[PDB]
């Protein structure tokens, strides 16, 4: 299939779509869709008392991946920053003190690339890298 489409078989050519947020803690996103077209944008906003870190507006690219950096609303009361939730992923763990961990998993049929588990190190940093949920195609 040409750019921005994926074949239903391994080879009809269906349009690529970027994953929606499973959730977005302490903020909202607009438009709120089940999945997003290539070229479409999603804009993030935080509730009162929170800092928006990462990219507040992200665009869906033709390979099904969002550009920019993962948005997060972080109140800041933690030893490490809020690691956020990559779009397509689920995160277990709601504490960011020294030693605390968080585990990630790609929902739906997305392919996880990166560190499934991270620990809040002593210097205010998370271990490893950030997981990124790829579409099964591409």
């Amino acid at each position, epitope marked *: 299939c040409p750019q921005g489409l994926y074949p239903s078989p391994a080879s009809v050519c*269906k349009p690529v*779509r970027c*994953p*929606a947020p*499973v*959730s977005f803690e302490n903020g*909202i996103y*607009t*438009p*709120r*869709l*089940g*999945s*997003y*077209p290539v070229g*479409g*944008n999603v*804009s993030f*906003e935080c509730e009162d008392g929170f800092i928006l870190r990462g990219s507040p*507006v992200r665009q869906c690219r033709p390979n099904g991946m969002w550009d920019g950096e993962t948005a997060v609303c972080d109140n800041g009361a933690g030893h490490c920053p809020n690691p956020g939730i990559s779009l397509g992923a*689920v995160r277990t763990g709601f504490r960011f003190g020294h030693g605390d961990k968080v585990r990630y998993r790609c*929902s*739906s049929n997305l392919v996880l690339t990166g560190s499934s588990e991270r620990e809040c190190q002593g210097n205010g940093v998370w271990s490893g890298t950030e997981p990124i949920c790829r579409q099964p195609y591409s």
Partner: antibody
Amino acid sequence: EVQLVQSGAEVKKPGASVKVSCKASGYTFTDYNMDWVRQATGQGLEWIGDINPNYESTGYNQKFKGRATMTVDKSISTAYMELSSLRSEDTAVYYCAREDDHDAFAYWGQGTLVTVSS
Amino acid sequence: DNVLTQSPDSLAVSLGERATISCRASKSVRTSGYNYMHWYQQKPGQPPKLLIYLASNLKSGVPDRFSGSGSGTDFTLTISSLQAEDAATYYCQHSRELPYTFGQGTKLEIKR
């Protein structure tokens, strides 16, 4: 070519629960959320909540106080809305409605009448 | 929650004449350069039908006598030349935030 077909009319006593179904066809079911909206006869439209079939994650209007529960069965491209602890004021036509890429409700089920009364 | 107030609640328009319906949101529906306001038509016995998306864009298959304008908290739906099939109730709806909410509806009837 997109079609949303809902289950039939229901009649319920106060306190009971009702579960309305919405079968989707004509598009890739996981491309879009399914939303639910109701309309009391003669009155306006009220959004209930939505569900993302990819994740089975949900959002609800707070006014329903957790009484509404949305689920999906991806194998049959069907969404469900269960509303519990029914009151007479829940008498309404219930719609499933599906967004487009502008987050407008481009497609609507035919409606399901739910009558709640002693 | 955003409250959408439409005016008039009802109006009578002669066939061929212009009909204008307003929608005022209590909070702005504009973000990221788009106005997240949509308009629907509803007739008795049927679900609403989408007419206008993102304030001013005609949905495919809708006649071009329908148009929409406005930004921020102020919006209008205009039928430039009313036809008998246009008698219906019209609703605005925002998609700026949750809960999605609708206006109360404006009933458009044929004047005689």
